[PDB]
Amino acid sequence: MKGDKKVIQHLNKILGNELIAINQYFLHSRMWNDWGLKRLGAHEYHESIDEMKHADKLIERILFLEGLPNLQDLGKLLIGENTQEMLQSDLNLELCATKDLREAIVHCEQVHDYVSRDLLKDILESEEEHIDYLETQLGLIQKVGLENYLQSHMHED
Amino acid sequence: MKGDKKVIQHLNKILGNELIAINQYFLHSRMWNDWGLKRLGAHEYHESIDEMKHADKLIERILFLEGLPNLQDLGKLLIGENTQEMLQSDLNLELCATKDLREAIVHCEQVHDYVSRDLLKDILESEEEHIDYLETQLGLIQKVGLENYLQSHMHED
Amino acid sequence: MKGDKKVIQHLNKILGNELIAINQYFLHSRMWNDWGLKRLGAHEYHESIDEMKHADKLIERILFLEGLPNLQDLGKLLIGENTQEMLQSDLNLELCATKDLREAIVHCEQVHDYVSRDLLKDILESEEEHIDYLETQLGLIQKVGLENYLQSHMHE
Amino acid sequence: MKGDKKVIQHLNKILGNELIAINQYFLHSRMWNDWGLKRLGAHEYHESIDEMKHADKLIERILFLEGLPNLQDLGKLLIGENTQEMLQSDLNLELCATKDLREAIVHCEQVHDYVSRDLLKDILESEEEHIDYLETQLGLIQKVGLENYLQSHMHE
Amino acid sequence: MKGDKKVIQHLNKILGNELIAINQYFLHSRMWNDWGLKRLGAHEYHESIDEMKHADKLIERILFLEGLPNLQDLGKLLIGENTQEMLQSDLNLELCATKDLREAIVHCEQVHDYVSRDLLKDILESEEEHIDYLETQLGLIQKVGLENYLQSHMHE
Amino acid sequence: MKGDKKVIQHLNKILGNELIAINQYFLHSRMWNDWGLKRLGAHEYHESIDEMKHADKLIERILFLEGLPNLQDLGKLLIGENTQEMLQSDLNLELCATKDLREAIVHCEQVHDYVSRDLLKDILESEEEHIDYLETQLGLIQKVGLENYLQSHMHE
Ligand code: HEM
Ligand code: HEM
Ligand code: HEM
Ligand SMILES: [K+]
Ligand SMILES: [K+]
Ligand code: NA
Ligand code: NA
Ligand code: NA
Ligand code: NA
Ligand code: NA
Ligand code: NA
Ligand code: NA
């Protein structure tokens, strides 16, 4: 095993978080499509795809380091019952994810695994972009009203 | 809830099987790429993508029937340690999957859910194609020898 | 030095107004984008760019007239806290800007600097178009309601 | 408010440096064009545009972190009176800017704001490329002589 | 001079490793071509080219920092006598060379040379990709057998 | 082994000369680029690339003849401190290189290795073209003066 054992543990923890997000965002996407809120459904689908790509890169890095990627343990999905709950639940997940990313980066730096650190910083930038999106949507609900906000997400771009 | 309760249970069971296959095939794909067996890695990636598409269609059908798609419960991945074990483990998973598909189809027919039956028959045809592929690969190992078989899967098409 | 000294003072005053407007509109643009009101953010960015182009022409004219362009003194930015305040603040700024432009044109005419007058008249036409836009947006808020007005500016 | 308060102070300090550089380089550009040294004018315009783009990214990051971008305080422009002074003034400004960038990156690292650190590192790479350019121009003046150096920058 | 003296020493040490790798990989490439293992010859040629490009970037950074690039001291090449030995020798070089890159990055971080650190991190990612390639080839020899492995590298 | 042992010694001597020139010309190129003499930098880069191609052909020929190419022993680089020293150092190196080429050709002819002779004659033609270029550049410094000569090599 060529990589640092705790680095591999951290990468598997980030991978676990991405696996939760893949499933939660994919279900939320399809719930929004089922309700006819196709613009939200499409955007949330692309969020799910982006998490899938991050998970791929984490799996490839873990194998290069001769660790074992853990795709078996799936943590808790928090599926909302309406749009505001779904957005907030995504946001709560992202805030936990960025906490775990920052701890992983600290450890990669300490053991000089600079390539793993760069991979995680790239993922972190993407997750912060997702936080930006989510906070913006919740703010729009307040500025334009829920009924208008949902109306604006019926039809795709 | 507009759909038959047991139909929705069956669709969630098939969905559960697809979720196992997504992860097992994706990891097997990336293990083969890590070993430099890129033709196997590419083929197994496309198998994983195909299971993702089946899972999407099952989720959409469950929501239309006003059921709750279960993306939370992930069953047992059986990750092989070498090519022959990985192929056999995929094959064992597919044989369980087709058993469950046939039971689901029997029940859809009994309660006259002909659209759900057609969706499952489409998935079943794809899974039998995957069995065809897997049985063929294991037979090739015997006909050309393991070392030649692996050699033939180093470079992509 | 070929230029009239008071013409150069006037041109530097107009330049100072443009420099305030560049920064106020740019910040308002990025606030609207942060809030997800991308159509307002995009329009306000283009207003900021237009002020940048006016400032460029003023700098070039001042240098031709052998004056010293003043980019050092930045007057008061009035940043609003919500859409209605941001639009009204831009409008208040534009009304001050057009007052100064008219006084500058009067002086250019008196000392026969007709090319500077023509430059300032082109800038004034642009600033009056911006007043038109701002008064129209504030009127639309009254006609369609605030929530609908904001909704119509979410998407570009 | 998600952002670290001292990170936002640092980002506003870097923003303040960019705002000085935007105006100093833009004026230097238009001075060089007025003098007929169009190749210097064009290059310096592009330096001003690059600083504008950095300021934009800083404003956007500050707003994401729920801070208040400061476009109101404009520090000291040091406008040169001839080409050699203008280049050295830009270089003095860039050396101050890189010192502040390094101090900002240290603090971002300490509080684990790695995305802000990455933004500042990209800006720092751009500012060090500008130092490279400036040191090269000042060296060329010594190697080819001032008159030849200016001659080579008449035409674009 | 602007650069930290130990940073420049570290960059010259990395440059020295790249210069060994250029020549070792180029000779290994031409040995594989002479033996008719053209797929290995072509891949190894591209590894040598990639090291040449890294060397270029390091030379440019050393000169910007006002250090003296050292292309005179060439360290020890380890030339294999068959395919297995050549791949092992490349891997030995890469493992020793990535250790030096990590030590250089630690020092850049300590003295706040973040641009040098970023350059070395880009090179390090490339060298780890080469380690990935080399370990994979040695594993394929085990999995498919040496004769099949070489057969698969006859044709481009 | 098919090759004449002294032919292989001569080919390895010529290869050693090319390896010196690759590194000397590459560093001179990057020094000229650092100084903003980009036309000299580009031309010198191309000279380095041409020596790389000659080295490749020599390596291939040695391996065909069942000799061992020597990429380990790197002779003395003579790096100039300014343009006139750099050009003269390149010229001195080329004059040594052509002396060795002629002695290698004499020996190839004596032992009837006409294909090695032809390869060396093709290299010699390229090195004489480089001598032509270098002598011309030193002559231009005298004819147009150093400051004008350097000015003419600022822009590509
Ligand atoms: C281990 C977890 C997963 C990984 C690593 C993963 C990876 C990927 C990747 C790399 C792609 C290609 C994206 C692109 O290049 O644009 C993809 C596509 C896709 N994935 Fe996933 N995925 C995972 C789980 C899932 C799940 C659980 C679902 C749905 C329930 C899903 C649904 C999809 C769909 C619908 C596509 C697009 C298929 C198409 O091209 O038609 N994925 N996935
Ligand atoms: C807060 C301060 C400023 C910011 C954030 C800013 C930002 C920008 C940005 C992002 C662009 C587009 C650049 C590109 O994408 O190529 C731009 C264009 C430009 N800016 Fe600024 N700018 C600022 C101040 C100024 C000032 C004070 C002036 C002149 C006195 C100026 C002159 C220009 C010009 C001439 C253009 C090109 C317009 C065109 O496309 O015709 N900027 N600015
Ligand atoms: C044994 C020594 C070397 C050999 C045989 C060699 C050979 C080559 C060859 C054949 C090329 C392709 C040229 C073409 O076809 O146009 C090349 C490219 C190049 N070489 Fe070398 N080289 C050597 C050492 C070096 C060194 C020491 C440096 C710099 C320190 C260097 C820098 C470059 C660069 C920058 C390129 C262009 C690569 C690109 O942009 O794709 N090389 N070399
Ligand atoms: K509405
Ligand atoms: K075979
Ligand atoms: Na519905
Ligand atoms: Na936001
Ligand atoms: Na079959
Ligand atoms: Na109006
Ligand atoms: Na320089
Ligand atoms: Na491997
Ligand atoms: Na000549």
UniProtKB/Swiss-Prot annotation, chains C, D, E, F:
UniProt GO MF annotations = ferric iron binding; ferroxidase activity; heme binding; iron ion binding; iron ion sequestering activity
Sites binding Fe(2+) Fe1 sit at E18, E51, H54, E127
The protein's induction, as recorded, is: 24-fold increase in transcription in response to iron treatment.
Describe the disruption phenotype.
No growth phenotype in iron-sufficient conditions, cells do not store detectable iron under any conditions tested, cells secrete less pyoverdin siderophore and deplete iron from the medium slowly. Very low amounts of FtnA-only BFR complexes accumulate in vivo at low O(2) levels.
Record note on cofactor: Each BfrB homodimer binds 1 heme group coordinated by an axial ligand from each subunit.
Subcellular compartments: Cytoplasm
**Positions bound to Fe(2+) Fe2:** E51, E94, E127, H130
BP-aspect Gene Ontology terms: intracellular iron ion homeostasis; iron ion transport
Q: Which domain of life is it from?
A: Bacteria
Protein residues bound to heme b:
M52
Assembly and partners are described as: The bacterioferritin (BFR) complex is formed of 24 subunits (FtnA and BfrB) arranged as 12 homodimers. The holocomplex contains about 8.7% Fe and 8.0% phosphate. A pure BfrB BFR is a hollow shell with an external diameter of 118 Angstroms and an internal diameter of 73 Angstroms that binds 12 heme molecules and up to 600 Fe(3+) ions per subunit. The BfrB-only BFR has twenty-four ferroxidase pores which serve as a conduit for Fe(2+).
- Report further notes: The unstable catalytic diiron-binding site within each subunit (Fe1 and Fe2, ferroxidase center) also serves as a pore for iron uptake; the ferroxidase center is labile. In the iron-loaded BRF crystal structure additional stably-bound iron ions are seen inside close to the ferroxidase pore. Mutagenesis of residues reveals other stably bound Fe cations in the interior of the BFR shell; they may represent a pathway followed by Fe(3+) to the central iron storage core.
Give the protein name, as stated in the record.
Answer: Bacterioferritin BfrB
Origin species, per record, is: Pseudomonas aeruginosa (strain ATCC 15692 / DSM 22644 / CIP 104116 / JCM 14847 / LMG 12228 / 1C / PRS 101 / PAO1)
